[PDB]
């Protein structure tokens, strides 16, 4: 449905009253040390 | 004197709770001011189970009224019996739960819970010998579901040795279009499986189908649905409110009805089924009563009792009738329908008879069954839950309240385990 | 074989620690490649206390080098002995602690601590019989103070039955203008009071005054300050590094020096005081050494020893000298100065004599005193802390790291308690 809406011109940047876009919602729904030897 | 503390949470819980008090008040002769005006002494003999006796010989329900929705206080106070409730027992918030279980259980509900616990502590300590608690609530919304199950859990900490009984209204897309209701109900069932001793499954799916198919109502309203709810609640509590031998308290009912702790979800049924405004021309005979109350068309949970087996049954007959005829009829349904009764629990069907019938009926019967077919209700919710959960649909509304996705997984798994346990006992044989 | 694990944290800790290793490697005949080229079997007898024997008969310090500051690894590795150190024992982070104890103890330091603990665990398990740990660090900065005390606490959890010893550089506004140094030092002292078995108080106030007043240096540099540091650290570790009877291990030193668990802050002293490049024309006599090491102008902590009493003392004489003359002098300073020695701890002054003197000296002497006069150092810090703390000055730098203001109150109170305990024993009599 996200696809057919986008092909019919849906605005991907459109924000709701909580400042969220549609993809922000799907992302919200979705839910170490690096040893580097340096020469001196 | 075996007191029960009643708690009503949310819009549904308060709606059916109010109807419960209007109905049982009429049976006991108690008017909205708390005065008694009856003919029978059986009305007041066990009035103490549900009512406190205030100064001036008045009776006041031992009821706590809760809602995060502030507007609910006005609708309760404006009801026919809103005058009878203890003003200090009304605990209302300002911001509702917005059909969100997480808001009712963890955030807005948690902000209000200590105010409710203060009022249940006061009613409980005033009891000569508290039996336990009775909660009316729905599982599809946010307050009754989330805050009701939060209340159960907190009450269990302070009163672990008391019976926790609930009247839990199950959601149906036939009566509500709220997308998240399967989420709220699954999260609540997870709580009920662990923290209640006995739960009456009042299913909106069965209530809608009874109104539409049996009562012939094109568009059942909540009043129509709630007429069945109150009629059920009156029947299932008859043994607790009137003098009798069988299932006279919540603990003796649980010892008779629950053979395995988690298997405590009862399928309620009643006969004759009636609508508001339907007059009774003649009283049902004992065989009509017995046949109808066991019929799937008379169950308050949308489950086919012939798709499972009865672990235990409590049958309550109300009104003046032959006890010899009742016994014969009760033995007849068990011997004719022997394949829907577990053979490894001998004499699992207990029958009580109360002389006082409900309003407008000379004869009636209420059924309470602990049937393995109740898994049909849980499977229906589980399927709806899974359809959304696999798409991670609407989760931000719950995780945004601090909730972990792992809680949804745990609740789903627990309810699915419950279903496997019913199936295990359905397939058990007396080897 | 009584191994010690050495840890150096922060800019001061690594500066002092490198000088420690340059000094004791020279004393033990070890060159920057780890080869031995000495002229005495006494140099190798207990080499194992500080050095591991690697393949090829090489000696490598059992030292872990830690810093949060970027750029410090190169300056350590480029030092005179920078190549003797085990490459894997260097734990250097990207983001400094910005003179903030909270950053070193709770945030940046906590992000790096498990990498350090891995390397101390490996050195500790390789030990035939580990004595304990030695940490060099300052208390006025953020890494040595905060992360050093975090390391002490974590090391104490895994090795609770081992001695925790520190060389803790106290701050002075004479050498550093950083406004928050009294905060960092008070927070560190609170940690040291609870978690170390013995601490050498190397005070930058005393070091600056020795350089300025005694050595006649108009503007002492850190090299000047550290020339005294290295001389002290060499002297106080002599009993641990060479064959002897007295205080040969960290535990026997603690049993001799610490009557009460919290009173484990020592005031080191040394004779003769010299500057870098100053030649010794003649060796001091035994009375000159004894008189001087006990003099207030020769103490490494800015405290007047005649403003308190000595609970215990450890005196170490280094060089070829008469032991009869040493004993006479040690009995004379105690009999002539009897009012500055507690009478309820008989024979509280222990004296060792090691044949090997330090570099450029034919004779030297080192003093370790556990004096109640050390409260002058704690009172000075406490007063500086209180001046800012009552104004709630600069607290956002600490509470912004998640810290609670209550921790400052607890640290202030603990250090003030420590001061009252010294005063209690200062006033005690052998009644
Ligand atoms: N039978 C019945 N169900 C109700 C009633 N009111 C709400 N419900 C159901 O309860 C669910 C919504 O919960 P509700 O009690 O409105 O929400 P809450 O106020 O957040 O607890 C839906 O499944 C509704 O269909 C009522 O009066 N009777
Ligand atoms: N004696 C001495 N004090 C030092 C030295 N370097 C820094 N300090 C002192 O240590 C404090 C600053 O701590 P520093 O070790 O620079 O900070 P860190 O890197 O955050 O641990 C101040 O009181 C400085 O005067 C040094 O080489 N010798």
Q: Which residues of C touch A37 (CB under 8 A)?
A: 87
Q: Which residues of C touch A33 (CB under 8 A)?
A: 114-115
SS3 of C73, please?
Answer: helix
A29 CB-near residues (< 8 Å, 6+ apart): B392, B393, B394, B395, B396
Contact C88, C54 (CB under 8 A): no
Q: Using alpha carbons, list the distances in angstroms from residue B281 to B211, B230, B287, B302, B363.
A: 20, 22, 18, 29, 12
Closest-CA distance, B396 to chain A, in angstroms, reads: 5
Q: What is the DSSP letter of C30?
A: B
Q: Which ligand is nearest to the CA of B145?
A: 1
CB nearest C78 (choices: A35, A38, A40): A40
Q: What is chain A's alpha carbon radius of gyration, rounded to the nearest angstrom?
A: 20
Residue B24 and residue B393: Cα distance in Å, rounded? 42
C325 CB-near residues (< 8 Å, 6+ apart): C286, C287
Q: What is the strand order of the sheet B349-354 is part of?
A: B90-92, B63-67, B3-9, B130-138, B163-170, B198-203, B265-271, B363-371, B310-319, B349-354
Which residue's alpha carbon is at the smallest distance from atom 26 of ligand 2?
A: C12
Residue C383 and residue C340: Cα distance in Å, rounded? 25
Give the residues surrounding ligand 1 with Cβ less than 6 Å away: B 10-12, 15-16, 69, 97, 99, 138, 140-144, 169, 171, 175-176, 181, 204, 207, 222, 225-226, 229
Q: For the beta carbon of residue C146, count every other beta carbon within 10 angstroms.
A: 33
SS3 of B93, please?
Answer: coil
Tokens of residue C144, six digits: 């040595």
Contact C40, C165 (CB under 8 A): no
Q: Using alpha carbons, list the distances in angstroms from residue C254 to B297, B431, C199, C349.
A: 87, 75, 10, 13
B95 CB-near residues (< 8 Å, 6+ apart): B68, B108
Closest-CA distance, B395 to chain A, in angstroms, reads: 5
Q: By C-alpha distance, which of B101, B100, B153, B161 is closest to B129? A: B161
Q: By C-alpha distance, which of B270, B267, B257, B265 is closest to B301? A: B267
Which residue's alpha carbon is at the smallest distance from atom 4 of ligand 2?
A: C12
Search chain A and give the residue with CA nearest B394: A29
DSSP-derived secondary structure for B230-278: HHHHHHHHHHHHS--SSS-SHHHHHHHH-SSTT--EEEEEEES---TT-
Closest-CA distance, A35 to chain C, in angstroms, reads: 9
Question: How far away, in angstroms, is C151 Cα from ligand 2 center?
Answer: 18
DSSP-derived secondary structure for C124-146: HHH-SSEEEEEEEEESSSSIIII
Residue C214 and residue C369: Cα distance in Å, rounded? 21
Which residue's alpha carbon is at the smallest distance from atom 15 of ligand 1?
A: B12
SS3 of C315, please?
Answer: strand
C5 forms beta bridges with C133
C185 CB-near residues (< 8 Å, 6+ apart): C139, C140, C145, C170, C171, C381, C385
Burial-class residue B431 by CB neighbours within 10 Å (0-12, 13-18, 19+).
Answer: exposed
Q: Does C42 contact A at CB distance below 8 Å?
A: no
Q: What is the DSSP letter of A19?
A: S
Search chain C and give the residue with CA nearest A39: C74
Give exposure, B24-48, as e/b (b: 16+ Cβ within 10 Å): bbbbbbbeeebeeeeeeebbbebbb
Tokens of residue B142, six digits: 């946010």
Which helix H or strand E contains C182, and what residues bound it? helix C181-195
Tokens of residue C327, six digits: 């004993």
User: Among residues 54-93 of chain C, which lie with CB inside 8 Å of chain A?
Assistant: 73-74, 77-78, 87
Burial-class residue B261 by CB neighbours within 10 Å (0-12, 13-18, 19+).
Answer: exposed
Within chain C, what is the greatest distance between any pair of CA atoms?
62
Closest-CA distance, C131 to chain A, in angstroms, reads: 30
C73 and A33 in contact by Cβ < 8 A?
A: no
C267 forms beta bridges with C369
Q: Using alpha carbons, list the distances in angstroms from residue C264 to B193, B389, C39, C196, C251.
A: 59, 61, 36, 8, 12
Q: Does A36 contact C at CB distance below 8 Å?
A: no
DSSP-derived secondary structure for B302-364: S--GGGS-EEEEEEEEEES--HHHHHHHHHHHHHHTGGGB-TTSTT-EEEEEESPPPTT-SEE
Q: Which residues of A touch C73 (CB under 8 A)?
A: 38, 40
Instruction: Compute the half-sphere exposure of residue B156: CA atoms within 13 Å on the CB side of its CA.
Output: 15
Report how many helices (DSSP H) and strands (DSSP E) chain B contains, helices first: 15, 12
Testing ligand 2's pocket by substitution, the residue of C7, C141, C201 carrying the most ligand atoms inside 8 A of its CB is: C141
- The torsion defined by the Cα of A5, A8, A14 and A17, in degrees rounded to 10, comes to -60
∠ at Cα B165 (B25, B111), nearest 5°? 95
C354 forms beta bridges with C318
Residue C21 and residue C81: Cα distance in Å, rounded? 7
The structure's method of determination equals: X-ray
Q: What is the DSSP letter of C95?
A: S
Say how far residue B259 (Cα) sits from the centre of its chain. 19
Search chain A and give the residue with CA nearest C113: A33
Domains of chain B: 2-259 (3.40.50.1440), 260-373 (3.30.1330.20), 374-431 (1.10.287.600)
Atom of ligand 2 nearest to the CA of C138: 10
Residue C262 and residue C193: Cα distance in Å, rounded? 6
Search chain A and give the residue with CA nearest B402: A31
Question: Resolution of this PDB entry, in A?
Answer: 2.2
Which helix H or strand E contains B167, and what residues bound it? strand B163-170
A33 and C74 in contact by Cβ < 8 A?
A: no
Whether B and C touch (3+ CB pairs < 8 Å), yes or no: no
B169 CB-near residues (< 8 Å, 6+ apart): B12, B13, B16, B137, B138, B139, B140, B144, B202, B203, B204, B229
Q: By C-alpha distance, which of C188, C66, C53 is closest to C118? A: C66
Residue B98 and residue B225: Cα distance in Å, rounded? 22
Residue B8 and residue B69: Cα distance in Å, rounded? 13
Q: By C-alpha distance, which of C177, C178, C199, C179 is closest to C188? A: C199
Q: Which residues of A touch B396 (CB under 8 A)?
A: 25, 28-29
Which residue's alpha carbon is at the smallest distance from atom 13 of ligand 2?
A: C141
φ/ψ (deg, to 5) at B163: -75, 130
Q: By C-alpha distance, which of B149, B154, B162 is closest to B119? A: B154
Q: What is chain B's alpha carbon radius of gyration, rounded to the nearest angstrom?
A: 21
Contact B60, B86 (CB under 8 A): yes
Q: Does B393 contact A at CB distance below 8 Å?
A: yes
Which helix H or strand E contains B192, and what residues bound it? helix B181-195
Q: Tokens 């004992």 belong to which residue?
A: B286
Tokens of residue B382, six digits: 């589980």
Tokens of residue B42, six digits: 């059986």
Q: Tokens 């005006």 belong to which residue?
A: B37
Q: By C-alpha distance, which of B121, B126, B63 is closest to B90? A: B63
Contact B236, B368 (CB under 8 A): yes
Q: What is the strand order of the sheet C363-371 is part of?
A: C90-92, C63-67, C3-9, C130-138, C163-170, C198-203, C265-271, C363-371, C310-319, C349-354
């Amino acid at each position: 449905i996200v696809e057919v809406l986008l092909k019919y011109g849906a605005d991907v940047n459109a924000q709701d009253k909580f400042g969220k876009t549609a993809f922000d919602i799907s992302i919200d729904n979705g839910g170490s040390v690096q040893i580097v030897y340096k020469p001196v | 004197m075996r007191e029960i503390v009643h708690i009503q949470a949310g819009q549904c819980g308060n709606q059916i709770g109010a109807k419960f008090w209007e109905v049982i008040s009429d049976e006991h002769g108690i008017d909205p001011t708390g005065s008694y005006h009856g003919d029978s002494d059986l009305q007041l003999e066990r009035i103490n189970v549900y009512y406190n006796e205030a100064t001036g010989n008045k009776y006041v329900p031992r009821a706590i009224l809760v809602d995060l929705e502030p507007g609910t206080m006005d609708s309760v106070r404006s009801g026919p019996f809103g005058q009878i409730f203890r003003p200090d027992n009304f605990v209302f918030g300002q911001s509702g739960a917005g059909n969100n279980w997480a808001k009712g259980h963890y955030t807005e509900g948690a902000e209000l819970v200590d105010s409710v616990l203060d009022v249940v502590r006061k009613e409980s300590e005033s009891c000569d010998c508290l039996q336990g608690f009775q909660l009316t609530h729905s599982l599809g919304g946010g307050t009754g579901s989330g805050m009701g199950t939060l209340l159960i859990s907190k009450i269990r900490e302070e009163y672990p040795d008391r019976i926790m009984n609930t009247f839990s209204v199950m959601p149906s897309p036939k009566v509500s279009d709220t997308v998240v209701e399967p989420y709220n109900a699954t999260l609540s069932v997870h709580q009920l499986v662990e923290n209640t001793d006995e739960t009456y499954c009042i299913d909106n799916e069965a209530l809608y189908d009874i109104c539409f198919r049996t009562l012939k109502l094109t568009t059942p309203t909540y009043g129509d649905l709630n007429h069945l709810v109150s009629a059920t609640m009156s029947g299932v509590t008859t043994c607790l409110r009137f003098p009798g031998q069988l299932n006279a308290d919540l603990r003796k009912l649980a010892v008779n009805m629950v053979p395995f702790p988690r298997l405590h979800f009862f399928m309620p049924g009643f006969a004759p089924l009636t609508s508001r405004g339907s007059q009774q021309y003649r009283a049902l005979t004992v065989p009509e009563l017995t046949q109808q109350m066991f019929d799937s068309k008379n169950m308050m949970a949308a489950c086919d009792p012939r798709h499972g087996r009865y672990l235990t049954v409590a049958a309550i007959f109300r009104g003046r009738m032959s006890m010899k005829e009742v016994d014969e009829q009760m033995l007849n349904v068990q011997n004719k329908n022997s394949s829907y009764f577990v053979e490894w629990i001998p004499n699992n069907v207990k029958t009580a008879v109360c002389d006082i019938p409900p309003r407008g009926l000379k004869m009636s019967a209420t059924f309470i069954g602990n049937s393995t077919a109740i898994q049909e209700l849980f499977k229906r919710i589980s399927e709806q839950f899974t359809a959304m959960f696999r798409r991670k649909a609407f989760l931000h509304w719950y995780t945004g309240e601090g909730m972990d996705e792992m809680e949804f997984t745990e609740a789903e798994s627990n309810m699915n385990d419950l279903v496997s346990e019913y199936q295990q006992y359905q397939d058990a044989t007396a080897d």
